Amino acid sequence: MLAKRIDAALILKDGRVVKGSNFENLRDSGDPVELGKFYSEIGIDELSFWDITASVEKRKTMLELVEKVAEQIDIPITVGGGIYDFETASELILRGADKVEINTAAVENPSLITQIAQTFGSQAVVVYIAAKRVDGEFMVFTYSGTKNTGILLRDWVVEVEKRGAGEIVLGSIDRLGTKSGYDTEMIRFVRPLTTLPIIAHRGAGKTEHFLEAFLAGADAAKADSVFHSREIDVRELKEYLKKHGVNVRLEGLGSL
Amino acid sequence: MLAKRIDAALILKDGRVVKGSNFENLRDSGDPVELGKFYSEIGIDELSFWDITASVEKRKTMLELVEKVAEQIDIPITVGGGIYDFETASELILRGADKVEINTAAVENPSLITQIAQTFGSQAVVVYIAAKRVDGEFMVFTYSGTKNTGILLRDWVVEVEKRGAGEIVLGSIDRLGTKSGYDTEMIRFVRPLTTLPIIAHRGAGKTEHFLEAFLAGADAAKADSVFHSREIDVRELKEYLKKHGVNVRLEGLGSLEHHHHHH
Numbered sequence: 001m002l003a004k005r006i007d008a009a010l011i012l013k014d015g016r017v018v019k020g021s022n023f024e025n026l027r028d029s030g031d032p033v034e035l036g037k038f039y040s041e042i043g044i045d046e047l048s049f050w051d052i053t054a055s056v057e058k059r060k061t062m063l064e065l066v067e068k069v070a071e072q073i074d075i076p077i078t079v080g081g082g083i084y085d086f087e088t089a090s091e092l093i094l095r096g097a098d099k100v101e102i103n104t105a106a107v108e109n110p111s112l113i114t115q116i117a118q119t120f121g122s123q124a125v126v127v128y129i130a131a132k133r134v135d136g137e138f139m140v141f142t143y144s145g146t147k148n149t150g151i152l153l154r155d156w157v158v159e160v161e162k163r164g165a166g167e168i169v170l171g172s173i174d175r176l177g178t179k180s181g182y183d184t185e186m187i188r189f190v191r192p193l194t195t196l197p198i199i200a201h202r203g204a205g206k207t208e209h210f211l212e213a214f215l216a217g218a219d220a221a222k223a224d225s226v227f228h229s230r231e232i233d234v235r236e237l238k239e240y241l242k243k244h245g246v247n248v249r250l251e252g253l254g255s256l
Numbered sequence: 257m258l259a260k261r262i263d264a265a266l267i268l269k270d271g272r273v274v275k276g277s278n279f280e281n282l283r284d285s286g287d288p289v290e291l292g293k294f295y296s297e298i299g300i301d302e303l304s305f306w307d308i309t310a311s312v313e314k315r316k317t318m319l320e321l322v323e324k325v326a327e328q329i330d331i332p333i334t335v336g337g338g339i340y341d342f343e344t345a346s347e348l349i350l351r352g353a354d355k356v357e358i359n360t361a362a363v364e365n366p367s368l369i370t371q372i373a374q375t376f377g378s379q380a381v382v383v384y385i386a387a388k389r390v391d392g393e394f395m396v397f398t399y400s401g402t403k404n405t406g407i408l409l410r411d412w413v414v415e416v417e418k419r420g421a422g423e424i425v426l427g428s429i430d431r432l433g434t435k436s437g438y439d440t441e442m443i444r445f446v447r448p449l450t451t452l453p454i455i456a457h458r459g460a461g462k463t464e465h466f467l468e469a470f471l472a473g474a475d476a477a478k479a480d481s482v483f484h485s486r487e488i489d490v491r492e493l494k495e496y497l498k499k500h501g502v503n504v505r506l507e508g509l510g511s512l513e514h515h516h517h518h519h
Contacts, residue, residue, distance in 0.1 A: 109506040111506070111509050114515050164515035
Protein backbone atom coordinates (compact mmCIF):
# COMPACT_ATOMS: atom_id res chain seq x y z
CA MET A 1 0.00 0.00 0.00
CA LEU A 2 3.05 2.24 -0.53
CA ALA A 3 1.74 4.69 -3.17
CA LYS A 4 -0.86 7.26 -4.04
CA ARG A 5 -4.34 5.74 -4.34
CA ILE A 6 -6.83 5.93 -7.27
CA ASP A 7 -10.44 5.38 -6.15
CA ALA A 8 -13.63 4.99 -8.18
CA ALA A 9 -16.97 5.97 -6.65
CA LEU A 10 -20.33 4.52 -7.79
CA ILE A 11 -23.66 6.34 -7.10
CA LEU A 12 -26.48 3.82 -6.49
CA LYS A 13 -30.28 3.74 -6.30
CA ASP A 14 -32.30 0.60 -5.49
CA GLY A 15 -29.16 -1.38 -6.23
CA ARG A 16 -28.61 0.49 -9.49
CA VAL A 17 -25.76 2.65 -10.81
CA VAL A 18 -27.30 6.12 -11.39
CA LYS A 19 -27.10 7.27 -15.05
CA GLY A 20 -25.17 4.06 -15.70
CA SER A 21 -21.89 3.78 -17.57
CA ASN A 22 -20.40 4.14 -21.07
CA PHE A 23 -18.90 0.65 -21.07
CA GLU A 24 -20.55 -1.35 -23.90
CA ASN A 25 -18.09 -4.24 -23.52
CA LEU A 26 -19.78 -5.42 -20.32
CA ARG A 27 -23.07 -7.26 -20.05
CA ASP A 28 -24.86 -4.55 -18.05
CA SER A 29 -24.01 -0.83 -17.74
CA GLY A 30 -25.98 -0.33 -14.53
CA ASP A 31 -25.00 -3.40 -12.57
CA PRO A 32 -22.84 -2.29 -9.57
CA VAL A 33 -20.98 -5.54 -9.15
CA GLU A 34 -20.11 -6.02 -12.84
CA LEU A 35 -18.84 -2.43 -13.11
CA GLY A 36 -16.94 -2.94 -9.85
CA LYS A 37 -15.19 -6.14 -10.91
CA PHE A 38 -14.28 -4.38 -14.17
CA TYR A 39 -12.59 -1.38 -12.54
CA SER A 40 -10.73 -3.74 -10.16
CA GLU A 41 -9.37 -5.64 -13.18
CA ILE A 42 -8.00 -2.62 -15.04
CA GLY A 43 -6.38 -0.56 -12.29
CA ILE A 44 -8.76 0.94 -9.71
CA ASP A 45 -7.31 0.65 -6.20
CA GLU A 46 -10.48 1.05 -4.09
CA LEU A 47 -14.24 1.35 -4.74
CA SER A 48 -16.90 3.52 -3.08
CA PHE A 49 -20.55 2.45 -3.21
CA TRP A 50 -22.56 5.52 -2.28
CA ASP A 51 -26.27 4.71 -1.85
CA ILE A 52 -28.91 7.41 -2.26
CA THR A 53 -31.75 4.85 -2.07
CA ALA A 54 -34.77 6.15 -0.14
CA SER A 55 -37.70 3.74 -0.21
CA VAL A 56 -37.93 1.83 3.14
CA GLU A 57 -35.81 -0.83 1.40
CA LYS A 58 -32.54 1.08 1.77
CA ARG A 59 -30.96 -1.04 4.50
CA LYS A 60 -31.83 -4.37 2.84
CA THR A 61 -30.53 -3.20 -0.54
CA MET A 62 -27.07 -2.04 0.62
CA LEU A 63 -26.80 -5.20 2.73
CA GLU A 64 -27.62 -7.55 -0.13
CA LEU A 65 -25.38 -5.47 -2.35
CA VAL A 66 -22.35 -5.91 -0.05
CA GLU A 67 -22.93 -9.67 -0.08
CA LYS A 68 -22.43 -10.10 -3.84
CA VAL A 69 -19.65 -7.50 -3.95
CA ALA A 70 -17.26 -9.08 -1.46
CA GLU A 71 -17.78 -12.34 -3.36
CA GLN A 72 -16.67 -11.07 -6.70
CA ILE A 73 -14.26 -8.15 -5.98
CA ASP A 74 -10.86 -8.36 -4.24
CA ILE A 75 -9.79 -4.74 -3.75
CA PRO A 76 -10.94 -2.87 -0.62
CA ILE A 77 -14.59 -1.87 -0.55
CA THR A 78 -16.04 1.22 1.16
CA VAL A 79 -19.77 1.93 1.63
CA GLY A 80 -21.63 5.08 2.65
CA GLY A 81 -24.67 7.27 2.09
CA GLY A 82 -26.95 7.64 5.09
CA ILE A 83 -25.38 5.28 7.63
CA TYR A 84 -26.56 6.79 10.91
CA ASP A 85 -25.54 4.57 13.80
CA PHE A 86 -23.17 1.90 15.03
CA GLU A 87 -25.64 -0.96 14.44
CA THR A 88 -26.12 -0.10 10.76
CA ALA A 89 -22.34 0.34 10.36
CA SER A 90 -21.76 -3.00 12.08
CA GLU A 91 -24.10 -5.05 9.88
CA LEU A 92 -22.22 -3.73 6.84
CA ILE A 93 -18.74 -4.49 8.07
CA LEU A 94 -19.70 -7.95 9.35
CA ARG A 95 -21.17 -8.43 5.90
CA GLY A 96 -17.89 -7.68 4.14
CA ALA A 97 -17.35 -3.94 3.86
CA ASP A 98 -13.77 -3.19 4.72
CA LYS A 99 -14.73 0.36 5.60
CA VAL A 100 -17.83 2.37 6.37
CA GLU A 101 -18.27 6.01 5.47
CA ILE A 102 -20.22 8.44 7.57
CA ASN A 103 -20.82 12.20 7.21
CA THR A 104 -23.97 13.88 8.59
CA ALA A 105 -24.41 11.51 11.58
CA ALA A 106 -20.73 11.93 12.41
CA VAL A 107 -21.11 15.71 12.43
CA GLU A 108 -24.17 15.62 14.73
CA ASN A 109 -22.86 12.80 16.94
CA PRO A 110 -19.02 12.44 16.73
CA SER A 111 -19.03 9.66 19.35
CA LEU A 112 -20.28 7.54 16.41
CA ILE A 113 -16.75 7.66 15.00
CA THR A 114 -15.24 6.37 18.23
CA GLN A 115 -17.93 3.67 18.65
CA ILE A 116 -17.18 2.01 15.33
CA ALA A 117 -13.38 2.51 15.75
CA GLN A 118 -13.40 0.96 19.30
CA THR A 119 -14.63 -2.29 17.83
CA PHE A 120 -13.27 -2.42 14.29
CA GLY A 121 -10.19 -0.22 14.46
CA SER A 122 -9.67 3.27 12.97
CA GLN A 123 -8.85 1.56 9.67
CA ALA A 124 -12.54 0.74 9.25
CA VAL A 125 -13.70 4.33 9.55
CA VAL A 126 -13.99 6.84 6.72
CA VAL A 127 -15.39 10.34 7.29
CA TYR A 128 -16.63 12.30 4.23
CA ILE A 129 -16.28 16.03 4.81
CA ALA A 130 -18.24 18.25 2.36
CA ALA A 131 -17.05 21.84 2.51
CA LYS A 132 -17.75 25.12 0.81
CA ARG A 133 -16.34 28.64 0.84
CA VAL A 134 -18.70 30.82 2.92
CA ASP A 135 -17.89 34.41 4.01
CA GLY A 136 -14.20 33.77 3.36
CA GLU A 137 -13.98 30.64 5.51
CA PHE A 138 -14.12 26.94 4.69
CA MET A 139 -17.34 25.63 6.27
CA VAL A 140 -18.89 22.15 6.83
CA PHE A 141 -22.13 21.05 5.08
CA THR A 142 -24.45 18.11 5.89
CA TYR A 143 -27.56 16.43 4.37
CA SER A 144 -26.37 16.05 0.78
CA GLY A 145 -24.47 19.32 1.00
CA THR A 146 -27.69 21.21 1.72
CA LYS A 147 -27.18 22.34 5.33
CA ASN A 148 -24.64 24.90 6.56
CA THR A 149 -23.73 23.58 10.02
CA GLY A 150 -21.73 26.69 10.94
CA ILE A 151 -18.84 24.45 11.88
CA LEU A 152 -15.44 25.36 10.48
CA LEU A 153 -13.54 22.78 8.45
CA ARG A 154 -10.25 23.34 10.34
CA ASP A 155 -12.08 22.55 13.59
CA TRP A 156 -13.97 19.51 12.23
CA VAL A 157 -10.79 17.96 10.79
CA VAL A 158 -8.99 17.97 14.16
CA GLU A 159 -12.07 16.67 15.99
CA VAL A 160 -12.37 13.93 13.32
CA GLU A 161 -8.82 12.59 13.91
CA LYS A 162 -9.20 13.00 17.68
CA ARG A 163 -12.31 10.76 17.73
CA GLY A 164 -10.41 7.99 15.89
CA ALA A 165 -11.37 8.19 12.22
CA GLY A 166 -9.07 6.38 9.77
CA GLU A 167 -9.16 8.65 6.68
CA ILE A 168 -10.89 11.74 5.38
CA VAL A 169 -12.58 12.33 2.04
CA LEU A 170 -12.45 16.04 1.23
CA GLY A 171 -15.38 16.93 -1.03
CA SER A 172 -15.46 20.44 -2.40
CA ILE A 173 -19.02 21.63 -2.91
CA ASP A 174 -17.30 24.44 -4.81
CA ARG A 175 -16.41 21.87 -7.47
CA LEU A 176 -19.66 19.87 -7.70
CA GLY A 177 -20.30 19.12 -11.41
CA THR A 178 -17.18 20.98 -12.55
CA LYS A 179 -14.39 19.59 -14.72
CA SER A 180 -11.85 22.34 -14.03
CA GLY A 181 -9.88 20.31 -11.45
CA TYR A 182 -9.63 19.27 -7.78
CA ASP A 183 -9.80 22.00 -5.09
CA THR A 184 -6.03 22.15 -4.42
CA GLU A 185 -6.45 25.34 -2.34
CA MET A 186 -8.65 23.36 0.06
CA ILE A 187 -6.36 20.32 0.01
CA ARG A 188 -3.28 22.41 0.92
CA PHE A 189 -5.38 24.17 3.57
CA VAL A 190 -6.26 20.86 5.23
CA ARG A 191 -2.89 19.02 4.95
CA PRO A 192 -1.14 20.65 7.98
CA LEU A 193 -4.22 20.07 10.14
CA THR A 194 -4.13 16.27 10.23
CA THR A 195 -1.90 13.22 9.95
CA LEU A 196 -4.70 11.06 8.47
CA PRO A 197 -4.78 10.02 4.80
CA ILE A 198 -6.57 12.71 2.70
CA ILE A 199 -8.77 11.53 -0.25
CA ALA A 200 -9.54 14.30 -2.80
CA HIS A 201 -13.05 14.46 -4.38
CA ARG A 202 -14.93 16.62 -6.97
CA GLY A 203 -13.61 18.70 -9.87
CA ALA A 204 -11.61 16.15 -11.91
CA GLY A 205 -11.91 16.30 -15.69
CA LYS A 206 -8.48 15.40 -17.13
CA THR A 207 -5.38 13.38 -16.16
CA GLU A 208 -3.36 16.46 -15.16
CA HIS A 209 -5.81 17.32 -12.39
CA PHE A 210 -4.77 14.16 -10.57
CA LEU A 211 -1.07 15.04 -10.54
CA GLU A 212 -2.15 18.44 -9.24
CA ALA A 213 -4.08 16.90 -6.30
CA PHE A 214 -1.08 14.78 -5.36
CA LEU A 215 1.26 17.75 -5.44
CA ALA A 216 -1.10 19.54 -3.02
CA GLY A 217 -0.48 16.56 -0.69
CA ALA A 218 -3.57 14.45 -1.21
CA ASP A 219 -2.86 10.82 -0.40
CA ALA A 220 -5.65 9.58 -2.64
CA ALA A 221 -8.02 10.71 -5.36
CA LYS A 222 -11.63 9.74 -5.86
CA ALA A 223 -13.64 10.28 -9.05
CA ASP A 224 -16.89 8.94 -10.53
CA SER A 225 -18.65 10.35 -13.67
CA VAL A 226 -15.37 11.09 -15.48
CA PHE A 227 -14.41 7.38 -15.14
CA HIS A 228 -17.91 6.00 -16.06
CA SER A 229 -18.13 8.39 -19.02
CA ARG A 230 -14.72 7.24 -20.36
CA GLU A 231 -13.34 10.79 -20.44
CA ILE A 232 -10.38 9.48 -18.45
CA ASP A 233 -9.03 5.92 -18.91
CA VAL A 234 -7.78 4.46 -15.60
CA ARG A 235 -4.78 2.56 -17.00
CA GLU A 236 -3.83 5.62 -19.07
CA LEU A 237 -4.28 7.71 -15.91
CA LYS A 238 -1.92 5.50 -13.90
CA GLU A 239 0.66 5.33 -16.72
CA TYR A 240 0.57 9.13 -17.07
CA LEU A 241 1.11 9.46 -13.28
CA LYS A 242 3.91 6.90 -13.15
CA LYS A 243 5.61 8.60 -16.10
CA HIS A 244 5.70 11.82 -14.06
CA GLY A 245 7.13 10.38 -10.88
CA VAL A 246 4.02 9.69 -8.85
CA ASN A 247 4.16 6.45 -6.87
CA VAL A 248 1.17 4.52 -8.18
CA ARG A 249 0.82 0.78 -8.09
CA LEU A 250 1.37 -0.79 -11.43
CA GLU A 251 3.05 -4.21 -11.59
CA GLY A 252 0.05 -5.55 -9.72
CA LEU A 253 -1.33 -4.99 -13.18
CA GLY A 254 1.08 -6.15 -15.87
CA SER A 255 -2.17 -7.04 -17.60
CA LEU A 256 -0.52 -5.85 -20.81
CA MET B 257 -36.50 26.85 16.50
CA LEU B 258 -33.21 26.17 18.31
CA ALA B 259 -32.22 22.91 19.93
CA LYS B 260 -33.44 22.63 23.54
CA ARG B 261 -30.55 23.21 25.92
CA ILE B 262 -29.52 21.60 29.18
CA ASP B 263 -27.86 24.05 31.67
CA ALA B 264 -25.87 23.11 34.80
CA ALA B 265 -25.74 25.63 37.71
CA LEU B 266 -22.94 25.56 40.29
CA ILE B 267 -23.38 27.27 43.70
CA LEU B 268 -20.15 28.71 45.12
CA LYS B 269 -18.76 29.89 48.45
CA ASP B 270 -15.17 31.11 48.88
CA GLY B 271 -14.31 29.64 45.46
CA ARG B 272 -15.69 26.18 46.31
CA VAL B 273 -18.84 24.42 45.12
CA VAL B 274 -21.18 24.19 48.11
CA LYS B 275 -21.80 20.49 48.87
CA GLY B 276 -19.30 19.47 46.18
CA SER B 277 -20.23 16.64 43.79
CA ASN B 278 -20.16 12.85 43.36
CA PHE B 279 -17.79 12.53 40.35
CA GLU B 280 -14.89 10.63 41.99
CA ASN B 281 -12.99 10.66 38.70
CA LEU B 282 -12.10 14.26 39.46
CA ARG B 283 -8.98 15.30 41.38
CA ASP B 284 -11.02 17.72 43.51
CA SER B 285 -14.78 17.11 43.13
CA GLY B 286 -15.33 20.48 44.82
CA ASP B 287 -13.34 22.53 42.31
CA PRO B 288 -15.80 24.63 40.28
CA VAL B 289 -13.25 24.96 37.50
CA GLU B 290 -12.52 21.24 37.24
CA LEU B 291 -16.21 20.49 37.65
CA GLY B 292 -17.45 23.05 35.14
CA LYS B 293 -14.81 21.76 32.74
CA PHE B 294 -15.84 18.12 33.12
CA TYR B 295 -19.52 19.08 32.55
CA SER B 296 -18.65 20.82 29.25
CA GLU B 297 -16.93 17.60 28.17
CA ILE B 298 -19.82 15.20 28.80
CA GLY B 299 -22.93 16.92 27.46
CA ILE B 300 -23.93 20.13 29.34
CA ASP B 301 -24.67 23.04 26.96
CA GLU B 302 -24.25 26.10 29.21
CA LEU B 303 -22.97 26.78 32.71
CA SER B 304 -24.00 29.05 35.57
CA PHE B 305 -21.85 30.03 38.52
CA TRP B 306 -23.91 31.44 41.42
CA ASP B 307 -21.98 33.04 44.31
CA ILE B 308 -23.29 33.27 47.86
CA THR B 309 -20.11 34.56 49.50
CA ALA B 310 -20.89 37.40 51.94
CA SER B 311 -17.69 39.31 52.62
CA VAL B 312 -16.74 41.23 49.47
CA GLU B 313 -13.14 40.37 50.33
CA LYS B 314 -13.76 37.90 47.49
CA ARG B 315 -15.31 40.20 44.86
CA LYS B 316 -11.80 40.55 43.39
CA THR B 317 -11.49 36.81 44.02
CA MET B 318 -14.67 35.90 42.13
CA LEU B 319 -13.35 37.99 39.22
CA GLU B 320 -10.18 35.91 39.26
CA LEU B 321 -12.41 32.84 39.02
CA VAL B 322 -14.42 33.62 35.89
CA GLU B 323 -11.07 34.61 34.38
CA LYS B 324 -9.73 31.07 34.88
CA VAL B 325 -13.17 29.66 34.03
CA ALA B 326 -13.55 31.62 30.78
CA GLU B 327 -9.92 30.83 29.96
CA GLN B 328 -10.40 27.05 29.98
CA ILE B 329 -14.15 26.51 29.37
CA ASP B 330 -15.38 26.47 25.75
CA ILE B 331 -19.14 26.70 26.38
CA PRO B 332 -21.26 29.78 27.35
CA ILE B 333 -20.80 31.12 30.88
CA THR B 334 -23.47 32.78 33.05
CA VAL B 335 -22.48 34.47 36.33
CA GLY B 336 -24.75 35.61 39.18
CA GLY B 337 -24.81 36.56 42.86
CA GLY B 338 -24.87 39.78 44.85
CA ILE B 339 -24.75 41.78 41.63
CA TYR B 340 -26.34 45.18 42.10
CA ASP B 341 -24.92 47.70 39.60
CA PHE B 342 -23.57 48.22 36.08
CA GLU B 343 -19.88 48.18 37.13
CA THR B 344 -20.15 44.94 39.09
CA ALA B 345 -21.74 43.38 36.00
CA SER B 346 -19.42 44.98 33.44
CA GLU B 347 -16.20 43.93 35.16
CA LEU B 348 -17.42 40.34 35.18
CA ILE B 349 -18.42 40.50 31.52
CA LEU B 350 -15.01 42.01 30.80
CA ARG B 351 -13.32 39.44 33.05
CA GLY B 352 -14.69 36.73 30.76
CA ALA B 353 -18.36 36.15 31.59
CA ASP B 354 -20.59 35.63 28.58
CA LYS B 355 -23.79 36.45 30.49
CA VAL B 356 -24.66 38.11 33.81
CA GLU B 357 -27.66 37.03 35.87
CA ILE B 358 -29.55 39.58 38.02
CA ASN B 359 -32.76 39.43 40.08
CA THR B 360 -33.41 41.61 43.11
CA ALA B 361 -31.39 44.43 41.59
CA ALA B 362 -33.43 44.19 38.40
CA VAL B 363 -36.80 44.56 40.12
CA GLU B 364 -35.61 47.46 42.29
CA ASN B 365 -34.05 49.20 39.30
CA PRO B 366 -35.37 47.87 35.94
CA SER B 367 -33.12 50.25 33.98
CA LEU B 368 -30.15 48.23 35.28
CA ILE B 369 -31.27 45.75 32.60
CA THR B 370 -31.03 48.57 30.07
CA GLN B 371 -27.64 49.85 31.20
CA ILE B 372 -26.01 46.42 30.90
CA ALA B 373 -27.74 46.02 27.55
CA GLN B 374 -26.78 49.25 25.73
CA THR B 375 -23.13 48.25 26.08
CA PHE B 376 -22.81 44.48 25.78
CA GLY B 377 -25.83 43.65 23.62
CA SER B 378 -29.04 42.04 24.85
CA GLN B 379 -27.77 38.44 24.89
CA ALA B 380 -25.48 39.20 27.85
CA VAL B 381 -28.48 39.84 30.10
CA VAL B 382 -30.31 37.13 32.02
CA VAL B 383 -33.17 38.04 34.33
CA TYR B 384 -34.01 35.45 37.00
CA ILE B 385 -37.64 35.63 38.01
CA ALA B 386 -38.55 33.88 41.25
CA ALA B 387 -42.37 33.54 41.26
CA LYS B 388 -45.04 31.77 43.33
CA ARG B 389 -48.80 31.54 43.93
CA VAL B 390 -50.50 34.13 46.18
CA ASP B 391 -54.31 34.07 46.48
CA GLY B 392 -54.41 32.12 43.24
CA GLU B 393 -52.03 34.59 41.61
CA PHE B 394 -48.50 34.25 40.24
CA MET B 395 -46.45 36.80 42.19
CA VAL B 396 -42.80 37.91 42.12
CA PHE B 397 -40.52 37.42 45.13
CA THR B 398 -37.21 39.12 45.83
CA TYR B 399 -34.46 38.74 48.46
CA SER B 400 -33.91 34.99 48.02
CA GLY B 401 -37.64 34.55 47.41
CA THR B 402 -38.46 35.84 50.90
CA LYS B 403 -40.20 39.14 49.98
CA ASN B 404 -43.49 39.46 48.05
CA THR B 405 -42.91 42.52 45.87
CA GLY B 406 -46.55 43.02 44.96
CA ILE B 407 -45.73 42.69 41.26
CA LEU B 408 -47.54 40.23 38.99
CA LEU B 409 -45.28 37.84 37.08
CA ARG B 410 -47.24 38.65 33.91
CA ASP B 411 -46.44 42.36 34.24
CA TRP B 412 -42.84 41.68 35.24
CA VAL B 413 -42.15 39.19 32.46
CA VAL B 414 -43.32 41.74 29.87
CA GLU B 415 -41.34 44.67 31.26
CA VAL B 416 -38.15 42.63 31.44
CA GLU B 417 -38.33 42.21 27.64
CA LYS B 418 -39.09 45.93 27.10
CA ARG B 419 -36.07 46.92 29.23
CA GLY B 420 -34.02 44.71 26.92
CA ALA B 421 -33.04 41.46 28.60
CA GLY B 422 -31.62 38.62 26.54
CA GLU B 423 -33.41 35.66 28.11
CA ILE B 424 -35.45 34.61 31.14
CA VAL B 425 -34.95 32.02 33.87
CA LEU B 426 -38.30 31.11 35.44
CA GLY B 427 -37.76 29.71 38.93
CA SER B 428 -40.71 28.27 40.80
CA ILE B 429 -40.52 28.91 44.53
CA ASP B 430 -43.51 26.53 44.70
CA ARG B 431 -41.10 23.73 43.80
CA LEU B 432 -38.04 24.67 45.84
CA GLY B 433 -36.47 21.62 47.44
CA THR B 434 -38.85 19.26 45.65
CA LYS B 435 -38.03 16.70 42.97
CA SER B 436 -41.57 16.26 41.68
CA GLY B 437 -40.99 18.17 38.45
CA TYR B 438 -40.74 21.59 36.88
CA ASP B 439 -43.66 23.98 37.32
CA THR B 440 -45.15 23.34 33.89
CA GLU B 441 -48.34 25.24 34.67
CA MET B 442 -46.13 28.29 35.33
CA ILE B 443 -44.13 27.80 32.10
CA ARG B 444 -47.32 27.58 30.01
CA PHE B 445 -48.67 30.77 31.61
CA VAL B 446 -45.53 32.72 30.71
CA ARG B 447 -44.92 31.30 27.20
CA PRO B 448 -47.27 33.55 25.18
CA LEU B 449 -46.24 36.59 27.22
CA THR B 450 -42.71 36.95 25.77
CA THR B 451 -40.46 36.15 22.79
CA LEU B 452 -37.29 35.64 24.80
CA PRO B 453 -35.63 32.32 25.60
CA ILE B 454 -37.41 30.88 28.66
CA ILE B 455 -35.21 28.84 30.99
CA ALA B 456 -36.84 26.51 33.56
CA HIS B 457 -35.52 26.08 37.12
CA ARG B 458 -36.59 24.26 40.39
CA GLY B 459 -38.28 20.85 40.72
CA ALA B 460 -36.40 18.54 38.33
CA GLY B 461 -36.09 15.10 39.90
CA LYS B 462 -35.95 12.65 36.97
CA THR B 463 -35.40 12.60 33.18
CA GLU B 464 -39.07 12.64 32.20
CA HIS B 465 -39.28 15.98 34.02
CA PHE B 466 -37.17 17.61 31.29
CA LEU B 467 -39.39 16.26 28.49
CA GLU B 468 -42.38 17.66 30.36
CA ALA B 469 -40.70 21.08 30.63
CA PHE B 470 -39.95 21.26 26.91
CA LEU B 471 -43.50 20.21 25.95
CA ALA B 472 -44.51 23.18 28.12
CA GLY B 473 -42.66 25.46 25.74
CA ALA B 474 -39.47 26.03 27.67
CA ASP B 475 -36.39 26.60 25.50
CA ALA B 476 -33.86 25.39 28.05
CA ALA B 477 -33.92 23.59 31.40
CA LYS B 478 -31.48 24.42 34.23
CA ALA B 479 -30.71 22.11 37.18
CA ASP B 480 -28.03 21.69 39.88
CA SER B 481 -28.12 19.21 42.80
CA VAL B 482 -29.64 16.48 40.62
CA PHE B 483 -26.58 16.38 38.25
CA HIS B 484 -24.01 16.99 40.99
CA SER B 485 -25.47 14.09 43.05
CA ARG B 486 -25.62 12.08 39.81
CA GLU B 487 -29.27 11.20 40.44
CA ILE B 488 -29.60 12.09 36.75
CA ASP B 489 -26.78 11.36 34.31
CA VAL B 490 -26.26 14.05 31.56
CA ARG B 491 -25.40 11.67 28.77
CA GLU B 492 -28.37 9.39 29.58
CA LEU B 493 -30.61 12.49 29.74
CA LYS B 494 -29.58 13.71 26.31
CA GLU B 495 -30.05 10.23 24.85
CA TYR B 496 -33.53 9.77 26.36
CA LEU B 497 -34.62 13.16 25.03
CA LYS B 498 -33.29 12.39 21.53
CA LYS B 499 -35.09 9.02 21.68
CA HIS B 500 -38.43 10.75 22.15
CA GLY B 501 -38.16 13.34 19.44
CA VAL B 502 -36.50 16.31 21.13
CA ASN B 503 -33.95 18.23 19.11
CA VAL B 504 -31.02 18.31 21.58
CA ARG B 505 -27.28 18.73 20.95
CA LEU B 506 -25.15 15.55 21.03
CA GLU B 507 -21.82 17.00 20.07
CA GLY B 508 -20.47 17.15 23.63
CA LEU B 509 -21.22 13.52 24.33
CA GLY B 510 -18.21 11.27 24.62
CA SER B 511 -15.57 13.98 24.29
CA LEU B 512 -13.39 12.44 26.97
CA GLU B 513 -13.52 9.00 25.45
CA HIS B 514 -11.20 7.24 22.99
CA HIS B 515 -10.94 4.18 20.68
CA HIS B 516 -8.22 2.40 22.65
CA HIS B 517 -8.41 0.06 25.60
CA HIS B 518 -6.72 0.97 28.83
CA HIS B 519 -6.97 -1.88 31.30
